[PDB]
Amino acid sequence: MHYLDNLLLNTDSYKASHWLQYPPGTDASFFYVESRGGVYDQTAFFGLQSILKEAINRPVTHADIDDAKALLAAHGEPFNEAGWRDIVDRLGGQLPIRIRAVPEGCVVPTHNVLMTIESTDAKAFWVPSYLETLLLRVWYPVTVATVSWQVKQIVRDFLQRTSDDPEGQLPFKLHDFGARGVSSLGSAALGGAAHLVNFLGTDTLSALLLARAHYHTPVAGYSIPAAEHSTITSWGREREVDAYRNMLTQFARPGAIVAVVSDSYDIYRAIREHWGTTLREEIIASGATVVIRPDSGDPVDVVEQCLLLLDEAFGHQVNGKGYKVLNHVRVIQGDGINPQSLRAILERITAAGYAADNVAFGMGGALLQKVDRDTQKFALKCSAVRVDGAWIDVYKDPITQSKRGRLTLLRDRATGQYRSALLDEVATHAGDSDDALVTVWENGQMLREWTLEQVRAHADAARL
Amino acid sequence: MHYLDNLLLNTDSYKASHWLQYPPGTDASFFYVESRGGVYDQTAFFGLQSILKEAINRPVTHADIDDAKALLAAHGEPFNEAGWRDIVDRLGGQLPIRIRAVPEGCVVPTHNVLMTIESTDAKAFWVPSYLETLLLRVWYPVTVATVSWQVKQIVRDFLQRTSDDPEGQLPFKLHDFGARGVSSLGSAALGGAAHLVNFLGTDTLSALLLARAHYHTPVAGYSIPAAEHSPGAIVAVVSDSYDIYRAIREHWGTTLREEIIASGATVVIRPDSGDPVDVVEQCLLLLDEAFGHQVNGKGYKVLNHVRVIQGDGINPQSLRAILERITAAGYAADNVAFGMGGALLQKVDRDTQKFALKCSAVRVDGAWIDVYKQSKRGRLTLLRDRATGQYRSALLDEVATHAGDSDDALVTVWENGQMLREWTLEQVRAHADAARL
Ligand SMILES: NC(=O)c1ccc[n+]([C@@H]2O[C@H](COP(=O)(O)O)[C@@H](O)[C@H]2O)c1
Numbered sequence: 001m002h003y004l005d006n007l008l009l010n011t012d013s014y015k016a017s018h019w020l021q022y023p024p025g026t027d028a029s030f031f032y033v034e035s036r037g038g039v040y041d042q043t044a045f046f047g048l049q050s051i052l053k054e055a056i057n058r059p060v061t062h063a064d065i066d067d068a069k070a071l072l073a074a075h076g077e078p079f080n081e082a083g084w085r086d087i088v089d090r091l092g093g094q095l096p097i098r099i100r101a102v103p104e105g106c107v108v109p110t111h112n113v114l115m116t117i118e119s120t121d122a123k124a125f126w127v128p129s130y131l132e133t134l135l136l137r138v139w140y141p142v143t144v145a146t147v148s149w150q151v152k153q154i155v156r157d158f159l160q161r162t163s164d165d166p167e168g169q170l171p172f173k174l175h176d177f178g179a180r181g182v183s184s185l186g187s188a189a190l191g192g193a194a195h196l197v198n199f200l201g202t203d204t205l206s207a208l209l210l211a212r213a214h215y216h217t218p219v220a221g222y223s224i225p226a227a228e229h230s231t232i233t234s235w236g237r238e239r240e241v242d243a244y245r246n247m248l249t250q251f252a253r254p255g256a257i258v259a260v261v262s263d264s265y266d267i268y269r270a271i272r273e274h275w276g277t278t279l280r281e282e283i284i285a286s287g288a289t290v291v292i293r294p295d296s297g298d299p300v301d302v303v304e305q306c307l308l309l310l311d312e313a314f315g316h317q318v319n320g321k322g323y324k325v326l327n328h329v330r331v332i333q334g335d336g337i338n339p340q341s342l343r344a345i346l347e348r349i350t351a352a353g354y355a356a357d358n359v360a361f362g363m364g365g366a367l368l369q370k371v372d373r374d375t376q377k378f379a380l381k382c383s384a385v386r387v388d389g390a391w392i393d394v395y396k397d398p399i400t401q402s403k404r405g406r407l408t409l410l411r412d413r414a415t416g417q418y419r420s421a422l423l424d425e426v427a428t429h430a431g432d433s434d435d436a437l438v439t440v441w442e443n444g445q446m447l448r449e450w451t452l453e454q455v456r457a458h459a460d461a462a463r464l
Numbered sequence: 465m466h467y468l469d470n471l472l473l474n475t476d477s478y479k480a481s482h483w484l485q486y487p488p489g490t491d492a493s494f495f496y497v498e499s500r501g502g503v504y505d506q507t508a509f510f511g512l513q514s515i516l517k518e519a520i521n522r523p524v525t526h527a528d529i530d531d532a533k534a535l536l537a538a539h540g541e542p543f544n545e546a547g548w549r550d551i552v553d554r555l556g557g558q559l560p561i562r563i564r565a566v567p568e569g570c571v572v573p574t575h576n577v578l579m580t581i582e583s584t585d586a587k588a589f590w591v592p593s594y595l596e597t598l599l600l601r602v603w604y605p606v607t608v609a610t611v612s613w614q615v616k617q618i619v620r621d622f623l624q625r626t627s628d629d630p631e632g633q634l635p636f637k638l639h640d641f642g643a644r645g646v647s648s649l650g651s652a653a654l655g656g657a658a659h660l661v662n663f664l665g666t667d668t669l670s671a672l673l674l675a676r677a678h679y680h681t682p683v684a685g686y687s688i689p690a691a692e693h694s695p696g697a698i699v700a701v702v703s704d705s706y707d708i709y710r711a712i713r714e715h716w717g718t719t720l721r722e723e724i725i726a727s728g729a730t731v732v733i734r735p736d737s738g739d740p741v742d743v744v745e746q747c748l749l750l751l752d753e754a755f756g757h758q759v760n761g762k763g764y765k766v767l768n769h770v771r772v773i774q775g776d777g778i779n780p781q782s783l784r785a786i787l788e789r790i791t792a793a794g795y796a797a798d799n800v801a802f803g804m805g806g807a808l809l810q811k812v813d814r815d816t817q818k819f820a821l822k823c824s825a826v827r828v829d830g831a832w833i834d835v836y837k838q839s840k841r842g843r844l845t846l847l848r849d850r851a852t853g854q855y856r857s858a859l860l861d862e863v864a865t866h867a868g869d870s871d872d873a874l875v876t877v878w879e880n881g882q883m884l885r886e887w888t889l890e891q892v893r894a895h896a897d898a899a900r901l
Pocket residue numbers: 176177178179180181203226227259295334335362363364365366476478814815
């Protein structure tokens with residue numbers, strides 16, 4: 001929104017004053033971004049394109065400078081007015097930086113250069129450090145994309161073992177429910193979009209809006225009509241079955257998919273007590289796939305139970321792998337899902353003989369909110385400065401061998417393995433490796449740009 | 465940004481399909497928000513005003529409907545085109561709802577009505593539930609404001625025991641360093657603002673912009689420059705426990721100290737390594753050796769010329785552990801401040817305070833009926849007991865019957881396109897500050 005538009009105020013306060021802290025005769029700076037470890041050994045890189053389009057969407061102006069000079073003096077921070085005025089007057093307000101990055105969607109082992117930021121102007125060498133705050137927030141779409149990607153590898157494994165069509169099934173197995181459980185609208189759009197790197201099912205409309213505006217994708221994902229807790233109960237307990245039948249009247253057509261929520265005990269009652277008998281026929285006659293979502297009881301146990309109970313209500317087919325596929329009905333567990341309980345469910349149900357085709361998984365806050373900058377120990381570090389015309393390495397520990405100097409990422413041509421290297425070694429090892437980064441942004445201009453489909457192809461091709 | 469400027473698409477996909485799921489003859493609905501428990505026993509209510517100003521900043525338009533209709537059909541959801549067109553053509557595109565809420569800054573025990581949402585138009589009764597997704601996100605400013613307020617009560621306790629000016633010291637004792645570690649710019653602005661409900665110090669400039677645009681506050685908070693070491697009243701310098709020790713014993717430290725006192729500025733040391741508790745106590749012990757102290761009127765030591773801010777590993781537990789160690793060591797709580805970043809602005813979720821928005825009543829065939837899973841149900845509100853200030857939840861019909869003992873504690877903040885009751889941040893700060901454990 002409009003009150004946040006000024007780029008000069010999109011930073012931590014203390015970093016506005018960093019230009020005064022450089023040695024005299026400093027001429028240039030070079031930064032890199034990496035995951036220093038954390039929950040997973042590899043990260044799907046995603047979201048930088050959206051961050052750049054949204055946070056650097058116009059030249060800096062004199063009005064930006066006036067506003068930032070006034071606020072920062074009152075707030076108590078020094079502000080390099082003359083430095084910003086020169087950038088506006090001489091460089092047309094375009095940030096004199098070059099950003100290189102691994103193509104979005106690639107999956108890269110931890111401890112590797114994911115992007116570099118370099119100054120492209122001697123006077124305005126300090127601009128990269130000014131952008132650390134907004135750039136380091138790339139940790140969020142990277143981490144969400146990674147969590148979603150890791151779940152995809154678990155689901156893909158079980159579909160490969162138990163499904164006749166594992167890649168036809170896989171895009172719909174993890175559904176984003178996190179729009180209400182995430183901390184703002186912008187994070188819903190960006191984290192939801194990061195999920196869509198790996199799957200097609202989402203209820204986070206904001207992610208469609210971002211994918212459409214920033215990743216050239218008119219309709220990045222899909223969903224289905226689904227019942228709410230509130231709507232069912234408000235019919236009253238004496239007409240509760242009529243609420244479910246109305247779901248069928250409104251949405252159940254051949255080839256259509258409709259979800260209904262119910263607590264686990266009512267599901268058991270409906271299959272035992274024969275008032276659900278007319279619900280079964282209307283379900284069967286509809287030709288629709290009715291997805292049942294249990295919303296009480298143990299997240300793992302209840303899936304297996306629903307499968308067994310629905311099997312006796314609706315029957316099953318045995319597929320080519322020897323696993324049962326229920327007729328007409330499916331189960332989605334939307335509660336308590338994380339990579340461990342998800343794996344537990346899949347282990348439980350396939351051991352019971354049910355194909356992974358039968359179940360889907362909803363994740364909300366656990367996908368979009370329960371991540372932080374430490375999940376993958378994200379860092380954005382200075383690695384080199386040019387002083388008195390000479391580049392000097394910048395680092396803290398000499399060990400982690402530690403990354404220093406002007407850096408890039410290499411991909412080995414035969415194996416596809418990644419490794420970080422000095423820009424000095426992109427020759428030399430030509431023949432065995434190619435430079436895996438690309439220039440995505442330079443001096444106010446976005447250069448290399450991806451569609452979400454291009455992002456999806458990198459992520460889908462990556463395996464554990 | 466502009467690509468998110470369509471309220472019809474600020475919701476969960478399935479809510480597009482929802483108006484068809486009510487029983488026939490439904491013509492009103494009623495919802496309330498509460499914390500169902502979690503980490504703390506009470507929540508500081510904050511952020512709804514920002515959410516409404518941003519998420520409902522204009523009347524819905526026909527362009528909004530065209531856009532939503534096309535996207536939702538392709539996405540796979542039905543779309544109540546006629547219902548939205550009616551809201552545009554008949555109601556000027558203003559949402560027919562009434563939102564009531566406890567004044568922002570109030571601190572309310574869990575399991576209580578914090579806000580209510582009611583429909584005000586028979587034909588458009590389904591709008592409150594459409595808005596659940598964006599309204600329930602109020603959990604985030606509430607929870608940041610609560611974590612920040614819970615910390616404040618801890619520091620306050622130790623300042624009342626050890627400081628000669630507890631309430632003058634308190635507003636600077638928790639600083640926000642959270643902008644790198646939060647998921648987005650908008651979260652940074654809103655969560656940063658939620659912290660400023662309780663304190664004055666922040667490095668999250670985005671929070672100043674939100675407070676200025678949404679809470680009528682030009683300069684909501686302050687900071688000091690920080691020499692990272694590889695007017696000017698106060699300065700932060702980064703260090704470690706051993707570094708201070710080496711300065712004391714190496715001769716470059718006696719001229720280092722000469723410069724510090726000759727400058728007459730207060731130096732704030734931030735250690736960035738070591739056990740949070742041990743490193744604060746040791747820095748204090750070494751800084752006392754180097755610069756001396758005064759004994760304040762409670763008998764605790766206040767260092768000359770130096771302060772310590774611990775910005776690493778801070779949470780309500782380590783924070784208290786620190787305060788306990790230094791005060792047992794005889795040091796006043798004046799000497800130290802605390803920084804939180806992602807631990808404040810990011811490491812919270814909707815389950816921290818178990819936030820929920822629930823339908824409690826619908827009108828069907830003329831008659832109101834309760835909706836529920838003893839349970840809270842019906843058309844609800846919050847009461848404040850007039851003598852004790854204690855809150856409880858009640859049915860609207862009970863307000864008059866207890867008018868002698870209590871007042872209705874909600875206010876109407878928003879109705880039919882118009883914000884009514886509206887707060888400055890200083891009013892919010894006053895409610896939070898008056899509340900105690
Ligand atoms: N289409 C749907 O049924 C839908 C959409 C969004 C959220 N939800 C529900 O909202 C809850 C989300 O919980 P969390 O966001 O805290 O994970 C879950 O119960 C989820 O099932 C359901």
